[PDB]
Amino acid sequence: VTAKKSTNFADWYTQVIVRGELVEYYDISGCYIIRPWAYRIWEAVQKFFDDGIKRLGVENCYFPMFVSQAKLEKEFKPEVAWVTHYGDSELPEKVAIRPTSETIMYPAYAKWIRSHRDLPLKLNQWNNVVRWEFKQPTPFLRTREFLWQEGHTAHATEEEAYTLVLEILELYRQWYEDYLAVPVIKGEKSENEKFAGGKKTTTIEGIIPDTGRGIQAATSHLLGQNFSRMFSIEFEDEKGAKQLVHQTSWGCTTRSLGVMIMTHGDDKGLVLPPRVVAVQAVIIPIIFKETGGMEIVAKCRELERLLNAAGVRVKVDDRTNYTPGWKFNDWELKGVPLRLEIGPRDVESCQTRVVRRDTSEARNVPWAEAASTIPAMLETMQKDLFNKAKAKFEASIEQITTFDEVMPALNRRHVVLAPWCEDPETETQIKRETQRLGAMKPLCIPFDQPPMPEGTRCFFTGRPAKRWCLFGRSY
């Protein structure tokens, strides 16, 4: 890799994802080919998430990707893509490609939900969405077409709706921490930063490590009764009284893959968490100029077989006329956690020499212990990636109390955690003065609240503070 992650971040990223066989670049601006190597990780977290939501009793469906002008409105225009022709012929009416599916599902919900006996209704779909973005295209993080999951539910009490929102968030925390080994903070968006139609947005926030900029990784809204008013979704309660449902919607995209890449990669290339990577261990024969290659190769496939059995996603790189060192590089680029060398002396000893991707430390593992050790090592490695990552993160958060402390913190590539009065009016103020001195918005009010002494003034107004809140520059 030419560019360096701390010198030339933009170009680094571009390089690791292309060299690491994750994406391919494409002739439509904003759209990128997800390749097997990356796609599989999307499969990994998806199954996890999908199981998770099934346990909660959500069921999947599929609405159509095309929407009508008529239905698409309750008085963003640029971001919509419109289909106008079939071959040469116009359509008598232009149809939008969905940016979201709210305006498609809610009309149906009003029809379907008639009585308390229809609730709850918990649907979700795995679809693609299009949003012609004004902002700059970046692979995974912000693209013009993207895969996501998008869930919409409806309930007889807010209570029940809210509980679900929280469950889905915890599921997102896991998506990220347990599988991507990416640390994230649960919080609750500020009024101007939440979802407009929603009563409340809760969210998990990441911090691109070197940059010092926060980023939204997934959302989970309590929609309250608001869309229920709009699309007139009513139900007869136990009593007989017509009433409005309480609703939630939530979502998380292939952006997750992008955060995960940036969270772990280094100048040698990608570094992928073993829980979701495609090949966890790649066995590589080292053979000399002289003969005897066949035995080495043999013991490689034997060891492969033994590991497969033990559960390990193994793979032997046997490519002929292609020197081992070259291979070492190919797979390091691609982020494979363990490399397993086998040369003449490893055969005669009865071992493989095991090189770890994140730290580059080698170790001899006897074939006899491989099927316990290798699993052991990956499981170490996954927690390590999370833990190193979790700390860089923890580091990047300064707990302040006055406005004076902000621009120093900011200029150290840090984010701040400060007492706040939470008046929405202050948000655009704070954005502006910070840019004045690039801007810094509220990122989220975290659930894990450090203690708030009676007295505590808001850092920006002096008014009594309500709650700690994260502020910082963003993406």
Ligand X SMILES: O=C(C[C@H]1NCCC[C@@H]1O)Cn1cnc2cc(Br)c(Cl)cc2c1=O
Ligand Y SMILES: Nc1ncnc2c1ncn2[C@@H]1O[C@H](COP(=O)(O)OP(=O)(O)NP(=O)(O)O)[C@@H](O)[C@H]1O
- Could you list the residues that contact ligand Y (CB under 6 A)? 131, 133, 142-143, 146, 216-219, 251, 253, 255
Is residue 251 a contact residue for ligand X (CB under 6 A)?
yes
Give the 3-state secondary structure of residue 133: coil
76 scored as a contact of ligand X (CB under 6 A): yes
Asked if 425 interacts with ligand X (CB under 6 A), we say no
Please enumerate, as own/partner, the contacts of 73-80 that have beta carbons within 8 Å and a separation of 24 or more.
73/103, 74/103, 74/230, 78/132, 78/134, 79/131, 79/132, 79/133, 79/134, 80/131, 80/132
Specify the amino acid at residue 95. Answer: V
* Contact status: 59 vs its own copies (CB under 8 A): yes
Total residues interacting with ligand X, rule: CB under 6 A: 14
Decide which of ligand X, ligand Y, its own copies, none touches 172; Cβ closer than 5 to 8 Å per partner kind: none
Q: Which amino acid is at 251?
A: G
Site for ligand X contains 249 (CB under 6 A): yes
- Residue whose token pair is 């979201």: 100
To the nearest whole angstrom, how small is the minimum distance from the Cβ of residue 68 to its own copies? 5
Q: Which stretch binds ligand X (CB under 6 A): 55-63, 243-251, 353-361, 453-461?
A: 243-251
Task: Give the distance from CA 277 to its chain's centroid.
Answer: 15
Q: Which stretch binds its own copies (CB under 8 A): 91-99, 305-313, 419-427, 446-454?
A: 91-99
CA 66 – CA 95 distance, rounded (Å): 6
Q: What's the distance, Cα to Cα, between the start and end of the chain in Å?
A: 25
Answer whether 186's CB lies under 8 Å from 204's CB.
yes
- Residue 194 as a binder of ligand X (CB under 6 A): the answer is no
Answer yes or no whether residue 82 interacts with its own copies by CB under 8 A. Answer: yes
Of the candidates 346, 388, 280, the residue with the CA atom closest to the CA atom of residue 44: 280
3-class state of residue 330 by DSSP: helix
Asked whether position 79 contacts ligand X by CB under 6 A, the answer is yes
DSSP code, position 465: P
The minimum distance between CB 25 and ligand Y, in angstroms, equals 17
Q: Is 212 left (phi over 0), alpha (psi -120 to 50) or beta?
A: left
| CA–CA gap between residue 138 and residue 30 (Å, rounded) | 7
Q: Does 100 bind ligand X (CB under 6 A)?
A: yes
40 binds, among its own copies, ligand Y, ligand X, none (CB under 5 to 8 A by kind): its own copies
* Residue matched to tokens 């469906």: 61
162 phi and psi angles, rounded to 5 deg: -55, -45
Would you state the structure tokens that stand for residue 89, as one six-digit string?
């012929």
Q: Closest CB to ligand Y among 148 and 403?
A: 148
Selection from 158, 160, 216, 212 nearest residue 188 by Cα: 216
Residue nearest to ligand X (CB): 251
287 binds, among ligand X, its own copies, ligand Y, none (CB under 5 to 8 A by kind): none
Sole window of 127-135, 197-205, 359-367, 397-405 interacting with its own copies (rule: CB under 8 A):
127-135
Classified as helix, coil or strand, 79 is coil
Stretch that binds its own copies, among 12-20, 83-91, 176-184, 438-446 (CB under 8 A): 83-91
d(CA 71, CA 35): 35
> φ, ψ for residue 445 (rounded to 5)?
-95, 115
Q: What residue 315 binds from its own copies, ligand X, ligand Y, none (CB within 5 to 8 A, per partner kind)?
A: none
The residue range among 74-82, 283-291, 324-332, 336-344 that interacts with ligand X, by the rule CB under 6 A, is 74-82
Q: Which of residues 203-232 bind ligand X (CB under 6 A)?
A: 219, 221
> Which residues on adjacent β-strands are paired with residue 281?
338
CB of 134 to ligand Y, least distance (A): 10
Determine contact, residues 218/235, Cβ cutoff 8 Å.
no
Binds 249: which of ligand Y, its own copies, ligand X, none (CB < 5-8 Å by kind): ligand X
Nearer to ligand Y, 95 or 286 (CB): 95
Instruction: Report in angstroms how near the CB of residue 14 gets to ligand Y at its nearest.
Output: 17
**By CB under 8 A, residue 123 contacts its own copies:** yes
- For ligand X, the closer CB: 93 or 454: 93
User: Using CB distances below 5 to 8 A depending on partner kind, what does residue 253 bind out of ligand X, ligand Y, its own copies, none?
Assistant: ligand Y
Least distance from C-beta 233 to ligand X, angstroms? 16
Q: Select from ligand X, ligand Y, its own copies, none the partner in contact with residue 216, using the beta carbon and a kind-dependent cut-off of 5 to 8 Å.
A: ligand Y
Interface region with its own copies, contact rule CB under 8 A, candidates 38-46, 219-227, 361-369, 390-398:
38-46
Helices 293-309/367-395 angle, 10° precision: 70
Indicate which single residue of 6, 8, 84, 308 sits in contact with its own copies (rule: CB under 8 A).
84
CB of 96 to ligand X, least distance (A): 7
DSSP string, 91-130: EEEEEEEPS-SHHHHHHHHHHH--BGGG--EEEEEEEEEE
Specify the DSSP class assigned to residue 225.
Answer: T
Interface with ligand X (CB under 6 A): 76, 79-80, 99-100, 102, 131, 150, 195, 219, 221, 249-251
